[PDB]
Amino acid sequence: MLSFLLTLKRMLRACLRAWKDKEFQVLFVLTILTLISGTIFYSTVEGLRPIDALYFSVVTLTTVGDGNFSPQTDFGKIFTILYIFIGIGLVFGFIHKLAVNVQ
Amino acid sequence: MLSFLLTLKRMLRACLRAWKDKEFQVLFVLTILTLISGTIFYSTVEGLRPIDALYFSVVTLTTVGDGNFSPQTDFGKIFTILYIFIGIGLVFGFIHKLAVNVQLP
Amino acid sequence: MLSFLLTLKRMLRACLRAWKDKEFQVLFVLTILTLISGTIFYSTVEGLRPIDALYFSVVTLTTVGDGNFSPQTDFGKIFTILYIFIGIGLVFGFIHKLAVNVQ
Amino acid sequence: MLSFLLTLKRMLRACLRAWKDKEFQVLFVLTILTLISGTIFYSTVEGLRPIDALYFSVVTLTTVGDGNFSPQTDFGKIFTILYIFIGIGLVFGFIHKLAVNVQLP
Ligand SMILES: [Ca+2]
Ligand SMILES: [K+]
Ligand SMILES: [K+]
Ligand SMILES: [K+]
Ligand SMILES: [K+]
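Above: inputs. Below: predicted complex with potassium ion.
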């Protein structure tokens, strides 16, 4: 149906308009950064291959969680705790962003 | 007791009333599409029984998470990461939607 | 500090005012129901002691997840999938509720 | 590049500006209180090393979840359930807050 495609595209364009918003860009960059850091941290401190460090970081920053791995070192656990709150703060940021975008 | 039932019905009506929104519908189809892709991907690449691939896909895409399985291949891992952001995208989309339907006038 | 206690109490009263809202009551009852059902389902179909069925239901309906148990039977898995979406729908319900409560 | 930095700072200022809200503060203290209680509870009742009790408490209260540990006692289980709803309460509270600070005027 054309109605369907048209609606989808209207929405896609709306999503694209966001990647053009400075504040949204910031939020985006910060999480990308946060993802890099985490990848690096768990790679060195917890000794996980980069890909498994990125995975754990993602799955953790998004609250999906890893059904197998858990930080072994104490330093790892502390970092993971603060890491998670950064994620909570990051998502509220987007939430607030969207809540404002309508008005 | 009666107001409970009456309120429930009014709300239950609304949920359906929103099931008529063109944008809600697309989000729904996109989610179902995402769910189907995941199911295929994981049964294929991770060799998971189809029902296990759909299950992993659902719990992964909703941030619930699987307490036992994790992709074993680097391929599955990469896909899961992006898959999760799709999910995050889908949910914000719904949230944005609800946000608009509230602050309407 | 008195300022602190006063603010807290103002907020507690606000939370209490909600338990007096019919629509909120509904949302509440539905999840309680949903929790009962789940407890029963996983108890019989997956053979978990009621307490472990309630736990799995809660941890699953709230997206916390169980780091050990996963449904073994196919019927269990299908139910868990629909169960989770009920939860997503239930939480959006509260979300919408709150988003309206301000205006 | 400069607008990035300038925007970041303006936003970074706001987060702090909100750290001055009396209601945000209480929510924060309540969360810290909840976190401390959990840490005590789990090290005591579940015999978890203090840092493991705080960790389990954080991942549990944020719906992230622990991929390896689960309370072993029926006592720990009951507590975890309520604990999770406290967390759900805390988050809605913050959300409600953000909701109000947006739709202000
Ligand atoms: Ca596990
Ligand atoms: K998990
Ligand atoms: K979650
Ligand atoms: K969430
Ligand atoms: K989770």
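The pocket of potassium ion (ligand 3) is lined by residues A 63; B 63; C 63; D 63 (CB under 6 Å).
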